[PDB]
Design a protein around this nucleic acid. Structure first.
Ligand SMILES: [Mg+2]
Ligand SMILES: [Mg+2]
Ligand SMILES: [Mg+2]
Ligand SMILES: [Mg+2]
Ligand SMILES: [Mg+2]
Ligand SMILES: [Mg+2]
Ligand SMILES: [Mg+2]
Ligand SMILES: [Mg+2]
Ligand SMILES: [Mg+2]
Ligand SMILES: [Mg+2]
Ligand SMILES: [Mg+2]
Ligand SMILES: [Mg+2]
Ligand SMILES: [Mg+2]
Ligand SMILES: [Mg+2]
Ligand SMILES: [Mg+2]
Ligand SMILES: [Mg+2]
Ligand SMILES: [Zn+2]
Lengths: 129, 104, 86, 48, 60, 123, 155
RNA sequence: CAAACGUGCUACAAUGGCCAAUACAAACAGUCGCCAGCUUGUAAAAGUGAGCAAAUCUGUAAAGUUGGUCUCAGUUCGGAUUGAGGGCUGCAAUUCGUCCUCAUGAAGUCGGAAUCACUAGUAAUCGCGAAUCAGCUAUGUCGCGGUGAAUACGUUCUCG
RNA sequence: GGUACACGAAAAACCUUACCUAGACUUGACAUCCUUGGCAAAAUUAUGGAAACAUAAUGGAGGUUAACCGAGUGACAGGU
């Protein structure tokens, strides 16, 4: 009985596969060791942020497939993906996970550049005199 | 019975969207009224080109409007057609806007 | 800069006059509008009147001026002194 | 005490003028405008 | 000096690099859209009348 | 040090020491370094006579650093003794290539000699 | 003229020593938008602190930052000539924020070597109330004490 | 071009310079074009040459991670200027194209009085693409994504 | 001034180009209306040419003049 979750953040998909196991979780991202797929700049804890405060002793085998974005965006996708898979095993977990706001799409994406402006919200220097 | 055309790959593209859906409905209805197994009317990504034009005639480059032109695209591949379908394919009359990429 | 395979460049109108003018002993200034023609070894010894834009400035080519462009040894604009604004 | 001279330019550039003059006398009016050709249509219903 | 330049642009030049693109409706030389052969200020008038199929206003 | 009249820093690696010579930059220094086979990252102070002769020989084979200054000097004189407009432009201490001279190009004009902008009492 | 109070974004608990404040100072030393670089620099300084002070780095950091934290804040209020200052009690959130800003500002000006050792020295130099950030806090406190009279009038 | 101002780029550096290995985008564009691979070349590029009328083929992602080195110097910073040799486009590169290689190494060590923008994927910053275009020191313009902050107590003052 | 100054110009070597110096033209490089014929304009090769332009050449798609190629012709074309 596996579980599936689909997270997204900054145009980055995520396919998280939750498999019941009792021989250590063995976190895995895109068939590669997390310490090598990510700059291992301590970003690994973030994805596990909702999998820590509840538990990881249940040794859920993680099968992550992420295609798109940079590396923090990919990390954001799997946290939501981990949480969406978590919403099929013990619907109580949802309540406490909802609290910390770890069950909401961040809704934050890069704005479009506007004409006459040096960026999304920047604007040229103004000279009066 | 014959085929005379294996893997007829019809490709659709048009500047408009609603006409494109209409043409796919008409194409599918005729081709299913004859004995052909349609793979399916799949959508392809729409190539969008955007041109930026300054509104003012002489000065004020800052005030510049924008225009877009979308090339909506669809794919449709027919397995076996035969004369029974091909002869009925002659009376389809595709609205001008829709563009065909028949590849045989 | 200029490629190798291409080589040098003369308009071949300047080249034809120079060949004709070198054979003739009593050479006189050659009126050429081609500031684009590079100075070829055969040009040596002749004198040309390059169009600066207004007049024809006379240049006497030597065995040393060889290689650059014929218009490079003449000017086009002139600036020699400003004037106090205030 | 002088090792004659190892400069003087000319010689090297002389080959360059010869190359340029040979090109100029070679010049063939091969004026053209294009590259790839054919495969230019918008299709139909193969007979409408 | 407009009419003479328009006629000369239609006529073929003696060098390939001598050929430039001028708007086909008016005679404006700069800011010509090769995708449409129409300058920026004729493209606005034409786009606001519906003559060019598919050029709608953009919202992005 | 000992290489001609140049005094390469003694506490600095050889590949940078060669750059300190006038006629030898960095890329050409590496060419001499690789050609002589002497391994880089070897502080010049911790180097032996066997390398000091080979490096000198290849440097002598290349263009002498002292002759380059007179080579550039003859070339400017060569350009000015022809009467070229480029020579004239180099002559009056101005940009020799196509650089603009309206509001910029002060690296060849030294410090600014502020004059008096026009007087505008309005019109 | 606004009548609205701005919201506040989360501070985040630190990922190592679980001391929020570490993330704030990381963001303070941020330059060129490099999260990675800043974490490395800062974290390296705690390791240098271990090698030198033989004590827990979080405890030393709190002892430095808590000691640097000011109490009074002087707000400029001009009427006719110059400005008569007004001492006011700063909130707790701004207290930590101002402390961190000064710590970073005097750290990127020390005569030391790589900013790892530079920033490491400033914090260890501030745990004993003898440094550059301390002097700044001392100066503003003395200025407020001198201008105690106008504290009653604010605006 | 004796000068002055405006808007930007590059810097004055170890949050960095150089070298090696290496992970992760979105959007757009393309048959006088995109050009894979291969051969030659210190390199810009040349020759051969498939593939792609395109969710198929092509347009190397960089910051970022690790390792080595520099050890704070007007320097392995900074790249101006200048000399020479090459490559591409084009009849044609001197006036007046840009790229590469070599050579040189101006000023500049945070900038006076005074000023500008910005309230989250925003400021800052790193690359990518397109338009006009044979080519173009567009560092410009219009777009796309990677990393990603700080602060807002309040209307006494300031501008509208 | 704010509301000009990487603005018109989303590409000034030739072209662009509207400027200057020169070499050439006059119902004109382009157009209509009128009396009138079409048995061409191109492009390119020669010579003189800075190139405009001239003198000689293959005399040219076609469709009998459709479009244009012209003659005659004054109203006029043309002006960044
Ligand atoms: Mg007009
Ligand atoms: Mg220039
Ligand atoms: Mg800009
Ligand atoms: Mg380093
Ligand atoms: Mg594939
Ligand atoms: Mg200095
Ligand atoms: Mg540098
Ligand atoms: Mg040049
Ligand atoms: Mg310094
Ligand atoms: Mg706001
Ligand atoms: Mg910047
Ligand atoms: Mg105004
Ligand atoms: Mg011109
Ligand atoms: Mg006939
Ligand atoms: Mg007839
Ligand atoms: Mg008028
Ligand atoms: Zn127009």
């Amino acid at each position: 009985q596996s579980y599936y979750g689909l997270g997204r953040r900054k145009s980055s998909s995520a396919k998280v596969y939750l498999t019941p196991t009792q021989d250590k979780g063995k976190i895995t991202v895109n068939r590669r060791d997390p310490s090598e797929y990510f700059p291992n700049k301590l970003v690994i804890q973030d994805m596990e942020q909702p999998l820590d405060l509840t538990d990881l002793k249940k040794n859920f085998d993680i099968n992550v497939v992420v295609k798109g974005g940079g590396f923090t965006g990919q990390a954001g996708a799997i946290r939501l993906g981990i949480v969406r898979a978590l919403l099929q095993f013990n619907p109580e977990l949802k309540k406490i996970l909802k609290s910390k706001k770890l069950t909401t799409r961040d809704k934050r994406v890069k704005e479009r550049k506007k004409f006459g402006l040096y960026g999304a919200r920047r604007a040229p220097q103004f000279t009066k005199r | 019975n014959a085929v005379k055309y294996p893997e007829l790959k019809i490709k659709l593209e048009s500047y408009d969207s609603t006409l494109l859906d209409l043409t796919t409905k008409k194409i599918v209805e005729v081709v299913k009224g004859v004995d052909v197994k349609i793979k399916g009317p799949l959508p392809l990504p729409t190539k969008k080109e955007v041109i930026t034009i300054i509104r003012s005639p002489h000065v004020d480059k800052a005030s510049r409007e924008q225009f877009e032109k979308n090339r909506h695209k669809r794919l449709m591949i027919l397995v076996d057609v035969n004369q029974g379908a091909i002869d009925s394919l002659k009376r389809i009359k595709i609205p001008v806007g829709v563009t065909l990429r028949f590849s045989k | 800069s200029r490629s190798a395979k291409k080589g040098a460049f003369v308009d071949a109108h300047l080249l034809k006059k120079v060949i004709d003018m070198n054979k003739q002993e009593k050479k006189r200034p050659i009126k050429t509008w081609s500031r684009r023609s590079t100075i070829f070894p055969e040009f040596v010894g002749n004198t040309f009147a390059v169009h600066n834009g207004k007049t024809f400035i006379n240049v006497y080519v030597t065995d040393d001026m060889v290689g650059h462009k014929l218009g490079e040894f003449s000017p086009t604009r002139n600036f020699k002194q400003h004037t106090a604004n205030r | 005490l002088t090792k004659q001279t190892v400069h003087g330019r000319a010689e090297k550039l002389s080959g360059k003028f010869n190359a340029g003059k040979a090109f100029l006398e070679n010049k063939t009016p091969k004026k053209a405008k294009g590259k790839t050709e054919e495969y230019t249509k918008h299709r139909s219903l193969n007979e409408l | 000096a407009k009419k003479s330049l328009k006629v000369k642009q239609t006529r073929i030049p003696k060098f390939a690099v001598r050929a430039y693109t001028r708007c086909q409706r008016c005679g404006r030389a700069r800011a010509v859209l090769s995708h449409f052969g129409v300058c920026r200020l004729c493209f606005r008038e034409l786009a606001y009348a519906g003559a060019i199929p598919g050029v709608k206003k953009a919202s992005w | 040090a000992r290489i001609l009249g140049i005094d390469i820093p003694n506490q600095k690696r050889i590949e940078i020491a060669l750059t300190y010579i006038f006629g030898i930059g960095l890329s050409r220094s590496q060419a001499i370094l690789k050609q002589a086979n002497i391994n880089p990252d070897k502080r010049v102070k911790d180097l032996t006579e066997e390398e000091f002769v080979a490096i000198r020989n290849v440097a002598s084979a290349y263009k002498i650093e002292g002759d380059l200054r007179r080579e550039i000097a003859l070339n400017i004189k060569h350009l000015s003794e022809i009467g070229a407009w480029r020579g004239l432009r180099h002559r009056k201490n101005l940009p020799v290539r196509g650089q603009r001279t309206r509001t910029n190009a002060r690296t060849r004009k030294g410090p600014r000699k502020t004059v008096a902008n026009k007087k505008i009492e309005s019109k | 003229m606004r009548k609205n109070r701005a919201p506040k974004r989360t501070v985040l608990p630190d990922p190592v020593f679980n001391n929020t404040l570490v993330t704030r100072i990381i963001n303070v030393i941020m330059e060129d938008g490099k999260k990675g670089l800043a974490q490395r620099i800062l974290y390296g300084a705690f390791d240098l602190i271990e090698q030198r002070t033989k004590e827990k780095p979080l405890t030393v950091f709190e002892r430095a930052v808590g000691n640097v934290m000011p109490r009074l804040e002087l707000r400029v209020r001009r009427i006719a000539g110059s400005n008569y200052q007004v001492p006011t009690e700063v909130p707790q959130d701004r207290k930590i924020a101002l402390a961190l800003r000064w710590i970073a500002m005097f750290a990127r000006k020390r005569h030391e070597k790589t900013m790892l050792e530079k920033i490491a020295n400033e914090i260890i130099d501030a745990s004993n109330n003898t440094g550059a950030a301390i002097k700044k806090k001392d100066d503003t406190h003395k200025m407020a004490e001198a201008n105690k009279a106008f504290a009653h009038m604010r605006w």
